[model samples]
Target chain A: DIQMTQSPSSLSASVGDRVTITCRASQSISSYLNWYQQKPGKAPKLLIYAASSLQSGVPSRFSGSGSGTDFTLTISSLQPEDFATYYCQQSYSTPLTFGQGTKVEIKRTVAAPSVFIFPPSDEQLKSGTASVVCLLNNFYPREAKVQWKVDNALQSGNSQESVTEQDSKDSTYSLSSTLTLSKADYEKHKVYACEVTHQGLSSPVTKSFNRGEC
Target chain B: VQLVQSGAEVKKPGSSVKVSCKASGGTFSSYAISWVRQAPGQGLEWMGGIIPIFGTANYAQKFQGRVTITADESTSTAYMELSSLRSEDTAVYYCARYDGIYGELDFWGQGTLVTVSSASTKGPSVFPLAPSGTAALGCLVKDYFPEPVTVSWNSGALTSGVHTFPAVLQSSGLYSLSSVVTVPSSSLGTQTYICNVNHKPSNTKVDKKVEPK
Candidate 1:
């Protein structure tokens, strides 16, 4: 029942800025460190475990490393969705202890901040004939890849539409991509996926959606 | 897998006690331990639990206002304290390691006991009350161990209310116990009651609910 202590109670980061939090264990816990992120009213999701192994379905920008009494959780190119609190926990013993959360916020100190991307509303897609929009609400520095899979096979060169970036005064960024699908193509319950990659953090963050006829 | 339990303690009735359980081995920092209570006549009370790793704790809702759990990972141990000990706290208390993977009680300790007895008085008192739901139930027992046992409440003149007995530990090494029952919430304020401990020698029952204002 070693005590776990975390510092920098809170931190401020802008888009593309790197942020780090440190966790220290009372004794040698080996590398049983695990990291988790929790949003308001949401269950805590596991991010990194065994020190640096990323949990399935997490983003590459979120990486963890270190071992034996000391560990660190790092976020490269902070995204708006990453603003929630992060916690570090040790899995080495019973009655485990978790690090106090670190809250990441947008850097509000800058003037005329750089613009960020924001996903679009349904109204923006209503006018187009069978439109498919990829919303990457979970921000990362580089653009994510969007692909369409039809009938269990990958579909190539359907069409490339416009991309929109929304930047808030708080330095958060969001980006969305719209793809137009014909009536026949949209009704097939086609698989639409979004993928993004970053450094240090292994694996890309991906999400898939199926279309339903109105 | 080593659990460094806090030092042993000794106390009397009308007193309070707090104990700590420190964990080691595997990932001591990431797991949660559940607390269970086994007293003379009562089975296991699924006391609330605390995640030492996360500093997050949840009670059984029934125990929310009654119990508190805290942990210090630096010491690698979790602490549980019982307040206002009456004869009821005399049973053994155990700190069990909870494996979230299967959400089951994987490990348990033999448990420690605290006895409650009057400095001048001997055993316990007994009384008979009408059936129905208006009876206050309490008991005091000695020399109980190594078996699953519980205290129960019985209505109707002949015998039995809620009786808990220990289960034979299967080859798989898991054991279960039952709970004690109390009757008629508020009205039993001044009524006599029976505390029965279920054991081999046809069991023993104490008759009396001390009124300590």
Candidate 2:
């Protein structure tokens, strides 16, 4: 389907606060990234194309920066009306298969979030790629933050749900996100975390996972 | 626009050489610049191209390892580097603007010929790697100088019934040519075979003998 995946599907923020949403195309389509943001039940509005280049009449605060398969659609500062959902559409395919949306909501979180990675199978690993899924389990208030990094460098292509589900049993929440990277990175077996920030936690929660050979 | 390519080159084995083409007149970055190759008697092969504006380089798998293609927008030039020369490496190469986005080559460079062969290239070796009772005999000719070599079979007194293939350039910058002589059952007499190799640059005549196996 020419899948374009995203991370931390949802977020919580107040006015003047900046936040980032990510999108990764399934294949190499450098000049294909087209971004959109929709509020509530409204249709998505085009923001940028081929990543960095702004669409006509798009707000300057909403900018995109990336290349290859990694891209980031960033909102410079949050406005009260900015409580909405963002998506990245790809022009590389006809009836383009686009990314799932990551939503932004008003902040009201009450607990810290922890994350871990699920390693990929040998077949995927052999093909120079591995699906490293990030799980933010049992966080609170359903609104928070998460990010992906490679070699200690922040990456731009990620999909977020920000909110996966509200725990019916404990009233907490769990979010699942993923990224595909070189098998070499997966084998380096180093720190990979979903650095999360919530109003309840005084500091951002950095939960790490050590990838290893299966 | 025309691409001006480098001139004829004669290089030895184990060496590499770079050929360049300068594009002028037309919109330089408006199209893709690519390289193509043709042996002494072979047809054209599209090596691949580079988009000067996008910094995108694409190549055919056969040329990926030993060939490098580069394009420079500032100088309006494109280059192809063929490494590890051999006799089969002898060929005429051309640079052209590829209309990949539009389909086909629009502009071309004057083809350049590269000859790979050394004076010390070994002579020919005849063998019959054919199946049992086969009537076909094979001759393998090795590196010869200044390229453009002719390989033929000479058994006893005649040079008939022998078919010689063209010289092929090798990655080691040398030449390897193979020829074959097919004998009818009636002509299959108990006689030895001789392979003759004639190299142009040195005008050298060399031969190797092969007894029926």
Candidate 3:
């Protein structure tokens, strides 16, 4: 099996810009390279195969050309929808391998997300377990890290975060983070806060539910 | 030790896909079989491990009840059953030989691709037939929904050593596969080998001569 390496792990390009990503194999793989595009939460879609042949139905703006150990995938004009991660795969032999990945991000102004916290409902309070939901909306660039805190102490491995959801009309994204707590613990905690870190903000945005507010 | 995995699978939502890994070249019971999952663009995950000899199994905290891993001593095969499928389950599942002492996966099988999709029907897109080796030609067919495609070779009256690998599922809710056939090296440039792909909605053929190297 051959090792594949990709260059410029990631890049930022505006729409209509010409973008290119390069891939090199440890050995000559002839024309056995394949290319794929992967969007968030979606499977990787094959874009080019046999090195340069575009898979049917792929756009003409998407093209590939290379041989031996070096290959390049060229996007004539990057469309908004084309802003995603791209990869190169070698199909010359068994133990098939892929390039690390090259992510194409949108180059523009970023927007911070608005964080909102929802207290446990009556039904959740009646149950033994209660949950606090943190919602973030209207964020640009779509990448956000979330953390849950109890009484100023950080928490990990116990909370669940939803996949980023993009608004079809505006392209802004939203995400939800939920932390479940026992009724006893919920009553004992002084505060439960959801902290969101994004490129759009210089500092993490936090929203909390004060136990005493109830 | 060697492990041979079953072919790719295309299943509808709410359905199930079962994959098998058969061990050979060594005693199957001596090593445990570990299952790994790789979703597109995601890292490899340790789903579970099973030791057929002891009839014992352990699953990762994430896959506890979502997947079933069992083995058959008689056949020296390990089977993974995934049911109540969802879009998130779409991935390449691999079977590996667990080295208990080393705490590593020593050997691996060529992955089994299981695709779960709700997309509608479409015909396969067949790639050109190309020479795989001095005496072999290979064909690739992919991107078809509803999962039934047949590949045949016209080897200019000489036919032997034809092996069709399993149809792998793509992220686009389609299937892809590779089929290979063996031919005499002396027949290169003089023979015309054609690979024929037949699907319910369409039929296609591609042929090319292998230039003498």
lDDT of 3 at B90: 84
lDDT of 1 at A162: 30
Per-residue lDDT tens digits for candidate 2, residues B1-213, read 457776555677889989988888545757777676766534345576788788677776767798888877788878889999888888878776654432334456766667775545343322222211325454545445344555666734655544454454544455555555545545556666677766544446667664333
Question: How do all models score by TM-score?
Answer: 0.32, 0.30, 0.45
The list of candidate 2 runs beyond 4 A from truth reads A1-214, B119-213
Candidate 1 matches the true fold with a TM-score of 0.32
Docking class of 1: incorrect
Q: What C-alpha lDDT, on a 0 to 100 scale, does residue A186 get in candidate 1?
A: 63
User: Tens-digit lDDT track for model 2 on A3-116?
Assistant: 688766878775568888888878777666766665532234556766777767766888888877888988898665666667675555333445667877754336665544
The top-ranked prediction according to lDDT is: 3
lDDT of model 1 at position B103: 40
| Model 2's TM-score against the true structure | 0.30
Query: In order, what DockQ does each candidate have?
Result: 0.01, 0.01, 0.02
Alpha carbon lDDT of each predicted model? 0.53, 0.61, 0.69
Q: Order the candidates by TM-score, highest first.
A: 3, 1, 2
TM-score of model 3 (first chain only): 0.70
Each candidate's number of clashing pairs is 47, 32, 0
